[PDB]
From Swiss-Prot, chain A:
Its main location: cytoplasm. Keywords: Acetylation, Calcium, Cell projection, Cilium, Cytoplasm, Cytoskeleton, Disease variant, Flagellum, Host-virus interaction, Isopeptide bond, Long QT syndrome, Metal-binding, Methylation, Phosphoprotein, Repeat, Ubl conjugation. SMART domains: EFh. (Microbial infection) Inactivated by S.flexneri OspC1 and OspC3 proteins, which specifically bind the apo-form of calmodulin, thereby preventing calcium-binding and activity. One of its GO terms (biological process) is presynaptic endocytosis. Ca(2+) 3 binds at residues 86, 88, 90, 92, 97. The keyword Metal-binding applies. GO terms for molecular function: adenylate cyclase activator activity; calcium channel inhibitor activity; calcium channel regulator activity; calcium ion binding; calcium-dependent protein binding; protein kinase binding; protein phosphatase activator activity; protein serine/threonine kinase activator activity. This is Calmodulin-1.
Length: 139, 64
């Protein structure tokens, strides 16, 4: 962690702590998200906080915020998520199959996001994505 | 098979978290209701994207 990183994370913290009270609540979090054009439910906001609220008080103070923003397995879980679609255990997912899953399931990436993903992931350009290589790239 | 949406969302939040580090990634184009995206938008977007990644991480862990 750099001295520059910590100040940048303190600046980011302030954008959420509209209170100035030292903690981010679910309400301040939803306020920021709606300002960006999102409409999260209250349960979605709660799940966001709970993954970060290490003392279980229900809010996020700056050391908790910094802990999460500075954050090990992860690589393996993302591999395991790709392996869900690697039915034959290729180690590979088709660019076509990847675009389909990325665009139409879950968060629904845009086609331009998927373009960027595939251009970076398909190193040899054969239309087949070595997803273990791509997981490495992201981490 | 609830693994499929949870798996997709983990990949997508992870990638979106990675790609927001590139200030000129097309992942910034999704915020259609922001006239001019200033630096304070990007800073909050990066925070939100990290939180969503952690949520997706947990949800995938629970489905597997
Ligand atoms: Ca506050
Ligand atoms: Ca706390
Ligand atoms: Ca390839």
């Amino acid at each position: 962690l750099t001295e520059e990183q910590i100040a940048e994370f303190k600046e980011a913290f302030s954008l959420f702590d509209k209170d100035g009270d030292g903690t981010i609540t679910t309400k301040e979090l939803g306020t920021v998200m709606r300002s960006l054009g999102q409409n999260p439910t209250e349960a979605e906001l709660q799940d966001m906080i709970n993954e970060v609220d290490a003392d279980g008080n229900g809010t996020i103070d700056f050391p908790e915020f910094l802990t999460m923003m500075a954050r090990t397995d992860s690589e393996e879980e993302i591999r395991e998520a790709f392996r869900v679609f690697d039915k034959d255990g290729n180690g590979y997912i088709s660019a076509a199959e990847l675009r389909h899953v990325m665009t139409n399931l879950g968060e629904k990436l845009t086609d331009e996001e998927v373009d960027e993903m595939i251009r970076e992931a398909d190193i040899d350009g054969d239309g087949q994505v070595n997803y273990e290589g791509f997981v490495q790239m992201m981490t | 098979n609830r693994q499929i949406p949870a798996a997709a969302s983990l990949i997508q939040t992870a990638w979106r978290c990675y790609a927001a580090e590139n200030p000129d990634s097309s992942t910034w184009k999704i915020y259609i209701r922001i006239s001019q995206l200033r630096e304070h938008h990007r800073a909050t977007i990066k925070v939100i994207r990290r939180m969503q990644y952690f949520v997706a991480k947990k949800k995938f862990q629970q489905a597997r």
